[PDB]
Amino acid sequence: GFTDYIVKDIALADFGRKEISLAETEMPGLMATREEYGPKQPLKGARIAGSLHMTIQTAVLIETLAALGADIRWVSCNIYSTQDHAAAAIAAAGIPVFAVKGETLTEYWDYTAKLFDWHGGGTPNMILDDGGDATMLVHAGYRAEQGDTAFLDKPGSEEEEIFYALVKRLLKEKPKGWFAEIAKNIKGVSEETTTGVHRLYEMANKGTLLFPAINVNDSVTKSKFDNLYGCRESLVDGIRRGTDVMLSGKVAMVAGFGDVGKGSAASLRQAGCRVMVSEVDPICALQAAMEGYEVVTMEDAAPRADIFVTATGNKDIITIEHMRAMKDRAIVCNIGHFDNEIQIASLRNLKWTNIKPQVDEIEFPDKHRIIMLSEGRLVNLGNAMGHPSFVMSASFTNQTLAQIELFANNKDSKYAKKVYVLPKTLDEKVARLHLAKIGVKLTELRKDQADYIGVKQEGPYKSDHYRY
Amino acid sequence: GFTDYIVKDIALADFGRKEISLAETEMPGLMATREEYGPKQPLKGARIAGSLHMTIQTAVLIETLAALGADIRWVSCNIYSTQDHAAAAIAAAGIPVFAVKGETLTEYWDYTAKLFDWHGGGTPNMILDDGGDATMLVHAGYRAEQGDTAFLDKPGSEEEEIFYALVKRLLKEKPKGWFAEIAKNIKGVSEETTTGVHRLYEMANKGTLLFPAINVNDSVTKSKFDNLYGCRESLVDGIRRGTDVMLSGKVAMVAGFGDVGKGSAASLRQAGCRVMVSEVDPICALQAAMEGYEVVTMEDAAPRADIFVTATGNKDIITIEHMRAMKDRAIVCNIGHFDNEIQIASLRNLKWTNIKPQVDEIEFPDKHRIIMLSEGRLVNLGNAMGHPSFVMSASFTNQTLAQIELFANNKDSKYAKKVYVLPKTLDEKVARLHLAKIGVKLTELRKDQADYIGVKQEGPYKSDHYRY
Amino acid sequence: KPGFTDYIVKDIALADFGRKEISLAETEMPGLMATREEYGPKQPLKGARIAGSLHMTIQTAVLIETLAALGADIRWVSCNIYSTQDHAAAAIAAAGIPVFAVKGETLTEYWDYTAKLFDWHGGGTPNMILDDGGDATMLVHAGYRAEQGDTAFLDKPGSEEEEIFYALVKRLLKEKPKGWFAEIAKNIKGVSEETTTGVHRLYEMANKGTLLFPAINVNDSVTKSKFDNLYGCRESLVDGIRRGTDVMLSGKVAMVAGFGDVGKGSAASLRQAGCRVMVSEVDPICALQAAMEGYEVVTMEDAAPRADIFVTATGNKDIITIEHMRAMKDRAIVCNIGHFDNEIQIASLRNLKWTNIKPQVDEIEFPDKHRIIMLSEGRLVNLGNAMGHPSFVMSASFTNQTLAQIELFANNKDSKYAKKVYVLPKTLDEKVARLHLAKIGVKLTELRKDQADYIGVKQEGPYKSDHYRY
Amino acid sequence: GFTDYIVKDIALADFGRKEISLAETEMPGLMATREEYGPKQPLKGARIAGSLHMTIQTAVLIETLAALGADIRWVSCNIYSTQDHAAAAIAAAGIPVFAVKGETLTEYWDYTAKLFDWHGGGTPNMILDDGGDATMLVHAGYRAEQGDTAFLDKPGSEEEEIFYALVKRLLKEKPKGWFAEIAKNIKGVSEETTTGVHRLYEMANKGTLLFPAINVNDSVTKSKFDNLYGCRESLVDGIRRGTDVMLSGKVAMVAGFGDVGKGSAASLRQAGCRVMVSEVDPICALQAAMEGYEVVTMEDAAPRADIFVTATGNKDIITIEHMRAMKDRAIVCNIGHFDNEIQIASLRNLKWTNIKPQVDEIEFPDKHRIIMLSEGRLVNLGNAMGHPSFVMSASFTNQTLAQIELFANYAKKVYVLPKTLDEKVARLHLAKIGVKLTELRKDQADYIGVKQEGPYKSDHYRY
């Protein structure tokens, strides 16, 4: 009689469980974290609201949190990233989850709000976020509840107008003071991705951040593994499953050469494309040139490339003018967190023909066409299966450790309403937990060698400013 | 009122047509062939029986042959390689096709026989074959029809048993002399893949080959493109879609370093694996070592690689003893034409658990498991979408030109009952047809330079023994 | 000029060849050349007396002439006994700049030359140090410590170079005016330090409170560490091995100890050239990076009988021991690309039979007749057996150095630099990268104001947070 | 009392011997061939005139031929490819060699002629050639000696005028009939490189080839290894030693994508360049595009590449009009056999400034400059040390087996070694690089239609 969930089809649970079992073998850091902290139950009493792509990998994270004692409600943080068999397995485990691949924007936001109506009464006391949407709902509602309401009628994108409408509906329907009630009860947020962390630092800079936050993205074992190697593996996976094109012989353009753009350019080069890159940061541009990529503007690339990928975390990267100039049936996609890297909204008066889920052909007046993937939302998660389990084990061990820090290890107020990163000893621990699986044999410093370079034999091995 | 087909779901035809249209843009060699030969209708009067993976790419080939005047019947040459939407689109175009992804081996062989019961009555007068199964049916039936039946009672596998039962059934249910009538009427066969060509030369050398044959595999623009770059793109595609594992950090073992093994090892290394290779040919082994691969035996690799790929065209490459020695949840697959590279039958008293279509977990008595892709059949086609269209345009332009040669350019018996390859002029033409699409600007020999090296400005540019 | 004799080089007649390659390097060093054009009119280094201790290569000659073009008075030595390019040294001497640098100088010569930096022409001392590896900095600090009465460390040498260095310190205490090291320390306005090993020495002193003057850590400019250490070694490690040995790399197994910036570049050098590369590491993060890049991560004991080529890239000591070398295959190649020659236990080999093949290449034979090929007697192989990093990447390193000399000498009127270790601001790090883009055809996109606001940055940069790792 | 040689510095012999010893360890095929055939003395009675880059690797080949019984005289086949310490070691070993790094074209052809004045009297009875120059001397002299002398008054290049003057000088000095006497005594030639094999097939098709020839270049274990991997290792070595430029960040243009162009493009891309390629053959062009190289014309490349390499075996690939259009201080070089891929002659009117041996800066009227390596001669051998020893062991094991075949043991006058020998060459190299070959079971061998011991592939297989 468990009914507190919304998924595509609960009957997919058995398939979901099979793939979760397979992913466990590929996620030694999460499984070792269960073994270590299971007995101590550090998350007992935690009520974690999670907003994070409802994939097989996330399901292993969710069950790890639950094995550590947490009570949980979950949604995806993108309308196309859910893996419905993973969602069904979580629902079948009796954990409230509201996540469907292909849900509407209105559904997406209504589901986010359902995180905060805790089963049995009350609110969450922890947030685990990827992209900042659950955090944003709490802050925007609190802003309005304190009487600052005009921003809710500011012009916006289609999704923004839906978000403001949600906040108005909740102010109208929930008891007065609901958002302050939520904000009081949240002990911390851990945030996974570059875009969400930027939103966190903006709030802290403005003094509006309502609770302590750990920036998980900037663990070394997250940013230089998930953002880099994860996209190296999953960008071309998304493009292949969407289009099945031959990548050898093609030219690809990647906007951005931060961690995701580095991984994305490598994904395409390794798969056979000749890759060009755009950048605004002269250091990252020089890195791209030293790695052998031609560094060009998007105006230069638009008539040249076969495949375009936005990897910036910024907005208005590929415009209608660029797409007007592209060759017929050029492929366009986005691997940054949000769908305003490409001017999708400007395309909505053109003729769209759906090819299959997450693949559309868009026809201009002059009859040239472009192939758009996942309507401009995250292509690796929308057209394929996101990053593979092993690299998500590193990200999600960080997440689990950050939840433990904020929920369990803040009894001396070592985390204020500010943004923190995990300490390097824990970053190093995350890496250590993954070495045996992939056959690494680590050397140990002898004492005199440790002394010679000024480190402890057990680490940490690098200064605070080391960049790896 | 058209019913002469067997496909999984005819309602997939619209989706198939959308992806056929997209593939046409990616297949400039086939489309240019339609434009050149369309007006001359060189295949008017041809009745082509095709046995070749019923993919979107094959659908573009089928419609090219039809555009040149051919009447067609088609089947897939593997039980897992059909793309059901491509099959549906062909059926919806009124072309008889008998091809379902996941058909049984009994169905597979019954469908092959249906090639020869031409619609309206009569037989085919051309065969287009990939792997030699349709050609084998004709030759084995002919052998038995002439009185040599004893071999039909000594089946060496379950497949051989189904095939010999089929031959016996056709000898009873088809008219007296049916196999000789087919053999009389077939003007030629063109054969796509290394294994099928081996079978052709076997028959040619023994004097049993019943009609002229063109070896398409050994066109330069087939063997050095499809087998090499096709597998480079589509092997890791199959492994990713089947398993979603992280390839960076994994050790992969490829048996064979011919054209397919070269492309397969590159597929895995480019995707991040550390790749080991086995070989029996010292030249191919030395190539592999010079390309940086460790060259080892399968016994050395068995307990330590994460991923195993057979690429030999030979048999008994990965045995039950190897599989017993493998690490838990190692991945095993085959990209050679036939499944007996892996000893699949030796596994049939173990516990098999299906994960999803074409993915199975096999458990040994000691509880270790292996993950088997497509029950050991061609992994790129079974677990993904085979090679991408652009490279198949080169293979399939060769096939179209070969059909034209045997059907229309044999008035003078230039093709006897032996195996031939297309001339280098046609090989060069196939490459030329593909240059504009990918932006190649070819240089023209000045007249002085052509003289200096002793070629014509228009080619051919290399000796007949040049290896490229 | 005939009157000028204040130098020591191998052969002054190499100056014309030196000048031709300096001219070629100028085209390849746009950052340094742009820094001249920008700051030349302003003469920010007029009055600077710069003691430089840095590999006397063609690239260093373009740095020296940049400093002089900005107004600096200069004395120079190399920071390694095998890294000098004799034609570069000759060209600097022929320009009338005191330089004491010979490829193949002895350790005793090396340290006597370092001391000549501090005997300024016309009297007095330097007032700036530009250091690579910390040796000039160490001479001032060791002498100061001893001169203040703490001499115990001088009597306990534990390597040949250490005993030579300690004997130099004693000699200078004996021969110079009393208080000489304190007078040097008082006059040095700052040191800028190029390399990971030297910067470690600096932070050790700053943490003990013994650092005597402000220091800028140039190694940890993004446009030094993530370019010179990485791409420089990617280009010049295999160059050194090829010139020393002319072996085929395709088909060989290589072992790289360390997967920091130099080890990353070294492993890529060898893989790109065709080797199958194995890596060792002590840091689990760096080990996981190496495994993710496809390298087998093993211990040196596992690698010793397996690999054809060994490269130490750690900055640490005792990486390749006599036990490892005894276990190696016959005619295995061994070399070092970290700053100092104690990564390989070279001293443990000195009673074996050494057969010189050619400069910086030796065959070492064990009693059992097993042989190894040793490059540059375990000293930096890229500089010893080849020409070090190529000019273009050194332009990024040396533009940072020039900017750091301007900071310490000209921009410390308010004492913003105390006696501790600083890095250059990110806007200067970014400027260094900007100066190198046009030469290699990079077209940089301009952020619009709405895009810059969206990611919380100014259109003119800096584009990244302080803790961004690139 | 031996002085029948010309080397730059005989004092380099000890250095040459040390590097020959090192190369022996790296040349397991040559050394295994010495071990197997030394005691058989298959080349006893052979008098081999060799014309092949006088490198450390060639010294190991020479001493292998001698260990098989051969009497030898040797020259280099390029004026800048000799390694003087290798030449000195061969001289010190008592083998006539005439080879100096930097010898002039006049010296080059005088030295080639010395091959044929055998020590003790008589002529050679075998040729081992790389590029066909020794072979061409015999055939041109034979042609003229049979009365057809007018062509010798009509050269097309400075080198051909020197060559023709040599032929005239030999016809004047040597006994009447000398070229026919040489031609009668030469039992065969083995020819190493694509350009030389092109010359042989020209002569065979015109019906003028005077003796059997083995095309060593088209052994699989030569063309698919030396030309490909050898250039992959040694092209960038040459460019680095000549210029010391940073390759990451630069654009490089490679003309040709045959075996040498494939290896050359890979050399540059693996070293960090962004590589463009030209081709005339649509199949090779399509291969380059599918390997991810931009395929362009030289006119497209001229204003924008930083580095240009010719790898065609053809002529007039980089013209003065291309070089006029290049950026200031672009690097230009040639890895094909002959210097006429670049229009060096047309540059001789401009200002040249020597930087160091084999590196020159050439200044145009408008003051832009280009950097020319080895005056357009083979850059890997002129600016560095040619291919490394291990891959030359494969090429030179083929050469040794070919000399045995021609001397001691078809229909076509130019032929290739049989696949069983090609396979043997590869097998000899496997243990040193740690390869473990799998052995077919009898049923597996039958399944694929081969003998367990090979050959494993059809004669048309392209590898």
Ligand SMILES: NC(=O)c1ccc[n+]([C@@H]2O[C@H](COP(=O)([O-])OP(=O)(O)OC[C@H]3O[C@@H](n4cnc5c(N)ncnc54)[C@H](O)[C@@H]3O)[C@@H](O)[C@H]2O)c1
């Ligand atoms: N799809 C995934 O699985 C995945 C993985 C991790 C992060 N992300 C997302 O990817 C995005 C990028 O993240 P990141 O970690 O690489 O950030 P980053 O800050 O490291 O890199 C972004 C780069 O974009 C560049 N840039 C900004 N504006 C540009 C412009 N107009 N043109 C060209 N370049 C521009 C920046 O200079 C910067 O170097 C974020 O939205 C992040 O949340 C996605």
Ligand SMILES: NC(=O)c1ccc[n+]([C@@H]2O[C@H](COP(=O)([O-])OP(=O)(O)OC[C@H]3O[C@@H](n4cnc5c(N)ncnc54)[C@H](O)[C@@H]3O)[C@@H](O)[C@H]2O)c1
């Ligand atoms: N899946 C596809 O899309 C695809 C594409 C082209 C060809 N094929 C098939 O792939 C197979 C291989 O074709 P190919 O063109 O590479 O053939 P190939 O003859 O070029 O190469 C096969 C290699 O296997 C080696 N080999 C044979 N027995 C071996 C053993 N016991 N252990 C290790 N190595 C062994 C051979 O020496 C040979 O080099 C054939 O069955 C062919 O029909 C599949």
Ligand SMILES: NC(=O)c1ccc[n+]([C@@H]2O[C@H](COP(=O)([O-])OP(=O)(O)OC[C@H]3O[C@@H](n4cnc5c(N)ncnc54)[C@H](O)[C@@H]3O)[C@@H](O)[C@H]2O)c1
């Ligand atoms: N030759 C050159 O041109 C050049 C270029 C830049 C720097 N350097 C020198 O190279 C050295 C390395 O510099 P870096 O910037 O890479 O430093 P780094 O700190 O980034 O890397 C050193 C790495 O060595 C590892 N390590 C330490 N002891 C080890 C051991 N016993 N076994 C295996 N790994 C071990 C560390 O964990 C570390 O990751 C320094 O001496 C530096 O001064 C040389």
Ligand SMILES: NC(=O)c1ccc[n+]([C@@H]2O[C@H](COP(=O)([O-])OP(=O)(O)OC[C@H]3O[C@@H](n4cnc5c(N)ncnc54)[C@H](O)[C@@H]3O)[C@@H](O)[C@H]2O)c1
């Ligand atoms: N330097 C070395 O050590 C070395 C090694 C092996 C051979 N070689 C020499 O290299 C040359 C190339 O040999 P190969 O084996 O690669 O020959 P190849 O016939 O395999 O390749 C030459 C390529 O050049 C192309 N080509 C001809 N003219 C062209 C033009 N005008 N523009 C662009 N491309 C053109 C051809 O189409 C052909 O594909 C020969 O002279 C050979 O003797 C040099």
Ligand code: NA
């Ligand atoms: Na996944």
Ligand code: NA
């Ligand atoms: Na240099």
Ligand code: NA
């Ligand atoms: Na060499």
